[PDB]
Amino acid sequence: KYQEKQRKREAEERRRFPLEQRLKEHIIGQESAIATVGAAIRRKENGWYDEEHPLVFLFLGSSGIGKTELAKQTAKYMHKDAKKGFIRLDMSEFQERHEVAKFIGSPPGYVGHEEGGQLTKKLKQCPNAVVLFDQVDKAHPDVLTIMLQLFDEGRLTDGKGKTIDCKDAIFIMTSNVASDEIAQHALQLRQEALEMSRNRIAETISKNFKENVIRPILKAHFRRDEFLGRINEIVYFLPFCHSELIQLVNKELNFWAKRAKQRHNITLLWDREVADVLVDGYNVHYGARSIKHEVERRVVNQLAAAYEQDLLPGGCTLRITVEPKLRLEIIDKDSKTRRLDIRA
């Protein structure tokens, strides 16, 4: 009865603040991806999952749109700050066929045999871990052939012969395969939606795209239909709409405002025009990283120069303003809003 009460309390806690809202705190946009991953993890946590076959994701999309971020926050939801339950594996290190020894150790009679495997040790430490095979496409496909046993049934026999059950693990595979195709199709669908919207005012990735465009590209890159068949959910991360760009700029400015308030006690403020000016630095190919670098260039370098020159004392209200060049403005009263002379 106590275990059932604890399970009901955990279920009420998850229903109060599920993974969708916890991801929407960090991730911006990607509502299809958050919905897919949340429905899958809800199926897992509520006991409605086949315990034999582990849950396996493939996160596809352009660069810097929350693939690794959503994987990290998924791992933090499942295991909190426990580093054991988040087995990151940067698969760009695995560019050759012989790099499977990192997974499964080394055979008897060879160097590194006593240490055994790395992934098999980490999965022995936490069988139900969220293993993030980040940038899986950059590995050799023969290295991804080891993941067949680990995805169909959750087993990965090391060099010493010791198999480890990994059935409760949530494997996540970030990849930029068909990133250009997903980005172009999303932009085309948004253009068609805007066309239909303005036509009506004058008065979602389709399965065919997944099977006709993306499926041949994945079959070309991964070279094995069984590997793609083992994936439970090929998730599609789309590029950012303009509202999502304004939200990303507000997120980055809120991050720097929180750092300025916590560390230095500088109430950093800004206008909507500041976000509209910083959206122009968005590159479609680079994603959210372009907004972060634009905020670091335009805004944060001025803040660092003003702080080094002792122009930002503690407890000052510092408004960013568009003159388009952004310009800081320390505030003392309502009318008193002087610009800071940031010398070179």
Binding site for ligand AGS (CB under 6 A): 26-30, 61, 63-69, 135, 152, 174, 176, 248, 251, 288-289
Q: How far is the CB of 156 from a copy of itself (least distance, A)?
A: 8
- Residue 313 interacting with a copy of itself (CB under 8 A): no
Residues 1, 48, 200, 208: which binds a copy of itself (CB under 8 A)? 48
Task: Tell me which residues in 120-139 interact with a copy of itself (CB under 8 A).
Answer: 121, 134-135, 138
Q: Which residues bind Mg ion (CB under 5 A)?
A: 68, 174
CA pair distance 73, 22, nearest whole angstrom:
8
CA pair distance 243, 14, nearest whole angstrom:
29
Q: What does 27 bind: a copy of itself, Mg ion, ligand AGS, none (CB cut-off 5 to 8 Å by kind)?
A: ligand AGS
Scanning 14-22, 180-188, 241-249, 331-339 for contacts with a copy of itself by CB under 8 A, the matching segment is 14-22
Scanning 165-173, 243-251, 301-309, 333-341 for contacts with a copy of itself by CB under 8 A, the matching segment is 301-309
CA pair distance 248, 129, nearest whole angstrom:
29
Which residue's CB is nearer to ligand AGS, number 133 or number 209?
133
Residues 205, 213, 217, 228: which binds a copy of itself (CB under 8 A)? 228
Which residue's CB is nearer to ligand AGS, number 158 or number 244?
244
Q: How far is the CB of 71 from Mg ion (least distance, A)?
A: 8
Q: How far is the CB of 91 from ligand AGS (least distance, A)?
A: 10
Q: How far is the CB of 14 from a copy of itself (least distance, A)?
A: 7
Q: How far is the CB of 117 from ligand AGS (least distance, A)?
A: 21
Q: How far is the CB of 65 from ligand AGS (least distance, A)?
A: 4
- Residue 204 interacting with a copy of itself (CB under 8 A): no
Which residue's CB is nearer to Mg ion, number 145 or number 321?
145
Q: What does 113 bind: a copy of itself, ligand AGS, Mg ion, none (CB cut-off 5 to 8 Å by kind)?
A: a copy of itself
Burial label for 197, CB within 10 Å (0-12, 13-18, 19+), is exposed
Q: How far is the CB of 176 from ligand AGS (least distance, A)?
A: 5
Scanning 192-200, 269-277, 289-297, 318-326 for contacts with a copy of itself by CB under 8 A, the matching segment is 289-297
Which residue's CB is nearer to ligand AGS, number 288 or number 312?
288
**Long-range contacts (CB closer than 8 Å, 24 or more residues apart) made by 155-158:** 156/103, 156/104, 156/117, 156/119, 156/120, 156/123, 157/104, 157/120, 158/104, 158/105, 158/116, 158/117, 158/120, 158/121
CA pair distance 97, 284, nearest whole angstrom:
33
- Residue 179 interacting with a copy of itself (CB under 8 A): no
